[PDB]
Design an enzyme around this catalytic site. Structure first.
Site, PDB file in Angstrom:
ATOM      1  N   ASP A 271      -8.459  -1.773   7.337  1.00 50.28           N
ATOM      2  CA  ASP A 271      -7.671  -2.645   6.465  1.00 50.28           C
ATOM      3  C   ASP A 271      -7.231  -3.905   7.213  1.00 50.28           C
ATOM      4  OD1 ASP A 271      -6.160  -3.679   4.333  1.00 50.28           O
ATOM      5  OD2 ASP A 271      -4.370  -2.536   4.900  1.00 50.28           O
TER       6      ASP A 271
ATOM      7  N   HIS B 226      -5.663  -6.096   2.737  1.00 53.26           N
ATOM      8  CA  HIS B 226      -5.117  -5.935   1.404  1.00 53.26           C
ATOM      9  C   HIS B 226      -4.132  -7.037   1.003  1.00 53.26           C
ATOM     10  CE1 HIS B 226      -1.570  -3.752   3.144  1.00 53.26           C
ATOM     11  NE2 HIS B 226      -0.978  -4.201   2.049  1.00 53.26           N
TER      12      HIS B 226
ATOM     13  N   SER C 266       3.817  -6.104   5.350  1.00 52.45           N
ATOM     14  CA  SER C 266       2.522  -5.767   5.929  1.00 52.45           C
ATOM     15  C   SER C 266       2.054  -6.932   6.824  1.00 52.45           C
ATOM     16  CB  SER C 266       1.498  -5.466   4.833  1.00 52.45           C
TER      17      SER C 266
END
Lengths: 31, 290, 151, 36, 89, 151, 36, 31, 290, 89, 290, 89, 151, 36, 31, 151, 36, 31
Positions: F50, F28, F102
């Protein structure tokens, strides 16, 4: 006879499923 | 042995009973009814037809008193009148102003034509059934008329037979019935002596012959109008002719259960009703070919 | 992580607990959870265990109680004092627990929940507790001593 | 026949409805009052 | 004496008063006049007897409405059961 | 062993990690790896997790991070402080982690990687993390708390 | 025949292509997103 | 019939493989 | 059952229907059509042939006025001329310079040869179909002509038969057709009184006989040139002879569906078109050998 | 009466208007003139009747184009199904 | 020039068209229709009246076989009976018990009264319209009958006129109509040979004269009852008399659009329907007084 | 020739088929038979011609339903417009 | 043992009293009793005495006020000060009692209720009270001075 | 009669109701506003 | 007369009881 | 002279003001005025100005705020600090005003109201306010900067 | 006429109602949202 | 014509007043 056993087999579904439901709900509560 | 069976009351329908028992080779007894006949026992209550009026000559008596006496006659009427024919010009050629009396009278007699055509009021009673039944077993192609009641026995081929009481008691005939030759009418006629004016049974006699007659026509004497001695009256038309119109429902028309209706013995033929309990007493001999 | 269940008169008749992702209370405790959010949740009955539960709102899932099936014999604690666990039974002194205590947790020395109190059985000398527990696989268990009175 | 065809299917639709409704609702309640 | 005897039907009609064609079959000895019947409840047949002396099979005629019914038909003393499909008249 | 992933404006929107023979980053995170070599590699997506990965060039395979599936309850660490691992969940204080985080690893007391942060779920009191881990057999696992926002 | 021979092989090459492409790509992705 | 079943069997490969791929990818994700 | 079937309209093709029902042994009914015949109902609109021109003698009148009156004749023309024959040398041997008038006139009559050979303009109407059909079942080798319409019944072997409406309504004949003995031509002739010059129908008469004739030859009177009294005219050649050339597409040539064409009744034979819905009503008796 | 009856075909040709050789076979009794037919949809045969009195099998002739079709052919009342390979004319 | 106009189909309504063009002083052309007449072209299909039954003398033959042969006659019936007259007392004065045969026969002939009064079944076809139209312009008070179709031309005052197709095709007459002298009835009579018993058309003949007659009275021969030799029969009353009752809707009654109905030519007068597209070709001469 | 020409109406009735009384007026020379018309859309008049030789005015008759409509009426070649109030019949 | 009677605006317009087994308030005071239980009771009017009453719930019957008809001349007390009782009348200083005071009890030196204030009559120098009392037999009495204004 | 029987009982039930209701309610209020 | 006095006596109950209630409630309030 | 406008949850979403004889609040603030009297008044909308008003009860008219149209460039004040007025605009520091602040007055050094805040436009460096003012003649004016968000 | 008399007055009462309602309500709102 | 202009003038009131209301409410808001 086949029309009285295939048509008489669907009426045994309420005497077959309700029993397979009542014998599965009374055994799971008593064990 | 003592076999027992029942068979429907239906004409022309072949019936088969299979009796197989014990050591004996089985046996086939076939019996089919040829024709029933329901005949009610009737009793002629009375007879009716059109009547004929009889009016005697008037009895005029100047300045004197008449007085009619009772008479046996049917619907016998009579009446002494007064102040009938005032003077000579009065029509009587009488003297006194009103002292004159006139005896008038009349009665009813069965019409002449009656013996020829008439109607009978009858009483249908507990009917009984005949029967054309044809029994067979082995060799007995023979037919035999018998009564279909719990009692009447009958032997064929050395075998006792009883076609027991019909499974039911039904009849096309009511308690009272009437027959005008050839046609039977369920009906409720008036009783003897009951007769009503201008209606069926206005005159009634036990038999076509019977010297006695009961009549109620509402025959009424009238007063004479001074002018010409005579005896007038008022009556009601024949109850019989009136009936000819309102005959109505003939039994011959209504079919119930296929019943047929015949006037001479007055019965119902081949009705299809109930079952006839057959009962037999066969000998070991009958079981032949054991 | 424990909330009052109130009767119509406002009195506390039991407790609800935030544990393992859900709010849970003993079903026999018929009242309203003293909380604006939890009172508006629809509960799912787990009747065989005398429990009733609902998923905790996202904000409460954080510090909800942690449950452990590992609880060897010894001494535990609950709101009213020491609790003994021996021979498969949790006992407390007589005359200590009662009305309003259903819903309260039994805690271990690390702040984890070991059982939920449903009521108790006054056995003259000690009071044996009726409790809801879970085994290693997370299966619900309800243990009830004879003479148990649902507080 | 129209009496035998209607009566059979009368307790047939009701057989697979009441039979499956009691078999699914009780199976769901058995799985819900157990998984919880 | 007749032995084994089997019944093979042919026609069937609801119509009251006979229809259909039942035909028994057998093997027999010496032969004489054999009787016929129907031991069953209903289902009859118009024929009290038939004769075997030829040393062959028999034929018969019967009645009955039923869409398809069975009946036991004797032949002298032997027996059997018959049945068949039917049709309206 | 950690590299910045930059947006077109040059801002750091996430991280890539050299671990167990490969470069890996959360899918992402749409940007460029701040490195002359790693930016020219073609990545293979592992969408269910992901993640996106590529084999590390020979020179980087040397000191790449070591991963361990053995990580019992307790306290771990990441770039922003202490991380608690309990009841199968990694939590951090509220208002500590966010945009750009992230791709960052959760480390244990021996310098080994225990999990990869994908984002988090603000649960009012604490923040629950969405993480990528591996089991004993080396199978990929992705755990995501409700309310998770992919940083 | 040329209409039945072309239509059959039309969905035959596309059957073993899309059928094997989805069976291999999904099998590879299932083995890759699992082994990793 | 054999030319309509051998030629009709290759068209069932996209209804056979795509199902054996969809029943193997939905069961491995749900378990 | 009341059997119903359909059979293609094709000659010489044996047809078999297998009727098996109920208790009865099955029955095979075979019927094949011997020959159809599509005959359109036609109405002779008119007749045409070549004509003959009739020109009366001129009426010359010196120094006087003539004046032709209208005449009933076909394509009747007339015109009074003036300044016709100037002087005696004028050709008339008349006095006045121009006062002279000449009446000219002429008309058209059907040629003599017409009754022998001519053509008929007809109107083909909703045609009907015949049929040679040969039915058989059990024993009935017999053939029977019948109409192939929804209505016409016909009994054979005690069985009602109806060869229903032909599955379609197609004909080789258009609304207007023309026949020049032996050959039928679909065509669009002009209407009666419509006739055009130098073309088919220039002269038309309802019948070969009919005393009346309509003609439009574009017969035009001309002025006499002084020299010799005469009456000249301009006309268009017979439309009929012209037609002989542009007859064109004969129906006899075009085969559609195998139709054959015959001029005497003017029909199309054995065309193969559509199916004939047979319908029967067979008695239980027919089912014989049950 | 004819019993069992089996159909064994021989030839088949697409050509319209008869070809091929169907030959029924059976066992019968008393024998008389038996009718013939084809209850099927298409597939006919030019022959309304054949006679059995000899106590032998029968032969027949038929039509039909179809590359290979089956049809039910009765013999008096008995029946059967026929079929066979075909060939162009 | 080539003027074009339309005028409503209405009698007695003066119509004015103003044609003004170019250098010419405008011109007023007035034309109003005197009376239309819709005459359908009809074709007598057949004729019907009441019939007369003809029953020949019976042919009795003791102990011998008779056999009637087919006969041409209308509704010809015949039947040979047997066991007719048992013995001499049998009524025949015959010997044999039943060997006797009697030939009975009968047929239907058109009643005598038919030529006098009868009905005609006709076929109304695509009708055409007449027209009394009176045109005028300048000086031409003259009236002229003409056809109101797209084709028919007509010259008046040196001007071509065409009263084009009526704006619509409507008629009070259906495909089949029937006339019982003086009254026209739209109706659907049965076809020739179609005739049904006890109903209109039971007997039908193409013309009042035509020697041929088709009849279907359901005339049925009966068996003689021994007593007196005779030949009884059952027949259905005349279909014609029956029709006299159910004549029904006469066209003479229904007015639509003012149509009038007359039986002799069988037409509808002065209906007011549609417009008649007039079209002319006037010469520059007509434009006179430019 | 007619000059100026003026139209003075008198009566008007809705009734179809003529009513009302139109009367033209003018001055003319030599005089002959003059035609008449109505160039308008509707509104007609039953009279194709009228004659002027007297050296006076003319009279005419017309039709039309309209409660009050105008129409141009020519007289030989001259023209004008007419109109008037109306009334039901 | 005294409760507020509030108007729709929440303002105190009078008082209700728990005494001798019942709740009682002056009828002219039209409002709601500021109490969850007492507000749901149906009152019985005693109009001749300007009073309205209801039976006290079981829990309130305990410490309800005690009433005494024995109250000789002297000084009593109420919420606003000393009250004098003389010549059969209870008087207070002028400008002391007013709106909202209806329903208040007049107390004696032993904590017993001697009368209930309904209003008063400003007599220039002193304010004479309109009161509800009871005699020895427990019969209701209502005494009202001329000029009385029902507070 | 049905007019005299209904009118009498109309004011009879209403007589013993309103008469006893006013005689009991007033007797109760007289005994309650006196015993208190 | 007895049916008009026994039926006319029940209507006097509202003129008898209401008076025996009004003469007992006005005397107990005035004394 | 300022009253809270509350949402159904009781939270303050805006303010109402007693000024120049009336109660007034921004129309976009949909809630209830936290006051027993003012909540029962029927308001008249002045939509073009995002305002809603009602006449003040007699008792509140006394110390209601005074408004002045005379407010030259300089520094003013409101609940959250200094307010600058320059170039016809009232600005405050960024990150100072927000939700709930609509309805608040901008005051001058004499306790008079100079404007009513409807919302603001975050212009990166400063926040420009959307305000309701009145001119010398008492005519309503609504000034709104681009980027304005109605608090 | 009854069709022309009803249709005219149909949009006449609705003309002076909707026309005056929009002319007064808008005039009142214009005078109220301006005077305030 | 007068009955079609006086009756046709009242229908123009909704096309006269609504315009004199819409041209007076759009000009007072835009100025």
């Amino acid at each position: 006879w086949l029309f009285a056993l295939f048509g008489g087999a669907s009426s045994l579904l309420i005497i077959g499923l309700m029993i397979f439901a009542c014998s599965m709900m009374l055994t799971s509560t008593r064990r | 042995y003592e076999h027992a069976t029942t068979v429907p009351n239906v004409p022309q329908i072949p019936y088969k009973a299979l009796v197989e028992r014990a050591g004996y080779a089985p046996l086939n007894l076939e019996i089919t009814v040829m024709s029933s006949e329901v005949l009610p026992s009737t009793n002629q209550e009375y007879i009716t037809c059109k009547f004929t009026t009889v009016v005697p000559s008037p009895k005029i008596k100047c300045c004197g008193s008449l007085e009619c006496q009772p008479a046996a006659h049917a619907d016998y009427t009579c009446k002494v009148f007064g102040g009938v024919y005032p003077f000579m010009w009065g029509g009587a050629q009488c003297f006194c102003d009103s002292e004159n009396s006139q005896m008038s009278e009349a009665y009813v007699e069965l019409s002449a034509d009656c013996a020829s055509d008439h109607a009978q009021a009858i009483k249908v009673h507990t009917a009984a059934m005949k029967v054309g039944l044809r029994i067979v077993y082995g060799n007995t192609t023979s037919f035999l008329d018998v009564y279909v009641n719990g009692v009447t026995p009958g032997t064929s081929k050395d075998l006792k037979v009883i076609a027991g009481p019909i499974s039911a008691s039904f009849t096309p005939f009511d308690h009272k019935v009437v027959i005008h030759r050839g046609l039977v009418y369920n009906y409720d006629f008036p009783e003897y002596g009951a007769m009503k004016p201008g209606a069926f049974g206005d005159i009634q006699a036990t038999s076509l012959t019977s010297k006695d007659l009961i009549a109620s026509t509402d025959i009424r004497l009238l007063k004479p109008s001074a002018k010409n001695v005579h005896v007038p009256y008022t009556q009601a038309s024949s109850g019989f002719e009136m009936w000819k119109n309102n005959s109505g429902r003939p039994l011959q028309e209504t079919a119930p259960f296929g019943c047929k209706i015949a006037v001479n013995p007055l019965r119902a033929v081949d009705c299809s009703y109930g079952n006839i309990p057959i009962s037999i007493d066969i000998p070991n001999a009958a079981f032949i070919r054991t | 992580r424990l909330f009052d269940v109130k009767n119509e008169d406002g009195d506390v008749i039991g407790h609800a607990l935030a544990m393992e992702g859900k709010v849970m209370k003993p079903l026999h405790v018929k009242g309203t959870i003293d909380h604006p959010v939890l009172s508006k949740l629809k509960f799912t009955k787990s009747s065989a265990y005398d429990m009733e539960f609902a998923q905790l709102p996202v904000n409460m899932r954080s510090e909800a109680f942690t449950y452990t099936s590992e609880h060897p014999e010894g001494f535990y604690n609950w709101h009213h004092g020491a609790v003994q666990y021996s021979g498969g039974r949790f006992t407390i002194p007589r005359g200590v627990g009662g009305r309003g205590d259903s819903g309260r947790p039994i805690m271990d020395n690390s702040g984890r929940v070991v059982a939920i109190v449903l009521g108790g059985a006054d056995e003259g000398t000690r009071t044996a507790l009726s409790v809801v527990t879970w085994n290693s696989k997370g299966k619900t268990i309800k243990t009830t001593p004879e003479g148990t009175e649902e507080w | 026949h129209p009496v035998y065809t209607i009566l059979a299917v009368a307790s047939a639709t009701v057989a697979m409805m009441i039979g499956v409704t009691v078999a699914v609702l009780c199976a769901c309640l058995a799985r819900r009052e157990c998984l919880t | 004496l007749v032995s084994t005897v089997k019944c093979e039907v042919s026609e069937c009609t609801y119509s009251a008063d006979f229809g259909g064609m039942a035909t028994l079959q057998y093997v027999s000895d010496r032969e004489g006049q054999c009787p016929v019947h129907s031991h069953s409840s209903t289902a009859t047949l118009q024929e009290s007897t038939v004769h075997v002396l030829e040393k062959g099979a028999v034929t018969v005629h019967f009645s009955t409405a039923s869409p398809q019914a069975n009946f036991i038909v004797s032949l002298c003393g032997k027996k059997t059961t018959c049945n068949a499909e039917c049709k309206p008249p």
